[PDB]
């Protein structure tokens, strides 16, 4: 059958003019117990593509196995496949897609949602989504899970359509993603203060910034509230 057991939280993301930002937090909850802390869900693949995975921890580990084999596979034969036929983001995507569909048909699904975040060799941005139903789509703002209706609204207020990707710079995007982790962190009851962040640029390569904390929280207001309504 397969149904979720141990589950992550959310991986959230948006496009900007010269690359894409994607960030995810470090959590494996086993329902009520938040049992694995410091187990990372962003997986850098290639050298320009970060593939951020939500849902099952079990399943996710076994799809990291296949990505690593895929770098080994593309390297074989050809020495020019690490220079101009490298693993593109659209490549890493296509294989992840196709695997989901085929597993859906036998009625034992690999229960994950993936964002495949990168930039092409042509310099185009690539942020594309797949889930366990097998559904694909691209958007300028993308988010897995709970974050697809929590974090996604805030992110999507910076980039609304495909003509505000040029106008959104690396510093406004940086801010928006920070902000959306904090918005999640308040109202989502499976979250962790630690989160990993990747920034994909089209001139400075992939930078993998680990082990950020969320700060600048609000709680200062909470001394004022007393009772539920009858008590004052």
């Amino acid at each position: 059958t397969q149904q979720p057991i141990v589950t992550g939280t959310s991986v959230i993301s948006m496009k900007y003019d010269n690359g894409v930002i994607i960030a995810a937090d470090n959590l494996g909850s086993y329902g009520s117990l938040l049992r694995f802390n410091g187990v990372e869900r962003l997986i850098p693949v290639g050298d320009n593509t970060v593939v951020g995975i939500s849902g099952d921890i079990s399943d996710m580990q076994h799809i990291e196995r296949l990505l690593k084999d895929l770098v080994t596979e593309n390297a074989y034969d050809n020495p020019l496949a690490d220079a101009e036929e490298a693993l593109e983001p659209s490549y890493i995507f296509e294989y992840l897609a196709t695997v989901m569909y085929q597993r859906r048909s036998k009625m034992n699904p690999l229960w994950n949602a993936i964002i495949v975040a990168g930039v092409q060799s042509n310099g185009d941005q690539f942020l594309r989504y797949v889930n366990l139903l097998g559904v694909t789509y691209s958007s300028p703002t993308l988010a897995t899970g709970f974050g697809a209706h929590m974090a996604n609204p805030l992110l999507r207020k910076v980039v609304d359509r495909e003509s505000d990707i040029p106008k959104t710079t690396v510093q406004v995007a940086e801010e928006a993603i920070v902000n959306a982790m904090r918005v999640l962190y308040y109202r989502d009851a499976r979250s962790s203060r630690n989160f990993s962040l990747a920034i994909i640029d089209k001139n400075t390569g992939l930078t993998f910034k680990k082990n950020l904390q969320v700060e600048n929280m609000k709680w200062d207001f909470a001394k004022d509230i007393k009772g539920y309504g009858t008590q004052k």
Binding site: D69, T72, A75, Y76, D77, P79
Partner: protein, 123 residues
């Protein structure tokens, strides 16, 4: 006595030698020369790659193919057949890496390919 001992290879000639397998050594002699220096640090492979004519493209063809991410395999003799032995260990190593989650040892690999090349002398 009898006639043959070279029509099949799961015969054994009376001396205690084989055939075909004894003849297959002459086949490897027709190949090019290829060396390996085992260094303290690693290994360094090198291969003579003939250029027949200027019709061919230089530095675009190879007799050094990678197996796993940390093993050179470089071969001489009949080149498609040598590429089939390289092909075989790419399969073998990927299974081992799936199964036991570590880069496949060189001594493990040495056993594995050895059994296969032995295996074709038994049918």
């Amino acid at each position: 006595i009898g006639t043959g001992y070279d029509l099949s290879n799961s015969v054994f000639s009376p001396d205690g030698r084989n055939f075909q397998v004894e003849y297959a050594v002459k086949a490897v002699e027709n190949g090019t020369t290829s060396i390996g220096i085992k260094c303290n640090d690693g290994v360094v492979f090198a291969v003579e790659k003939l250029i027949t004519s200027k019709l061919l493209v230089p530095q675009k063809n190879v007799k050094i193919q990678v197996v796993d991410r940390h093993i050179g395999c470089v071969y001489s003799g009949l080149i498609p057949d040598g590429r089939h032995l390289v092909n075989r260990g790419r399969e073998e190593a990927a299974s081992f890496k799936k199964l036991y989650k570590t880069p496949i040892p060189i001594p493990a690999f040495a056993d594995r390919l050895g059994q296969y090349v032995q295996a074709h002398t038994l049918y």
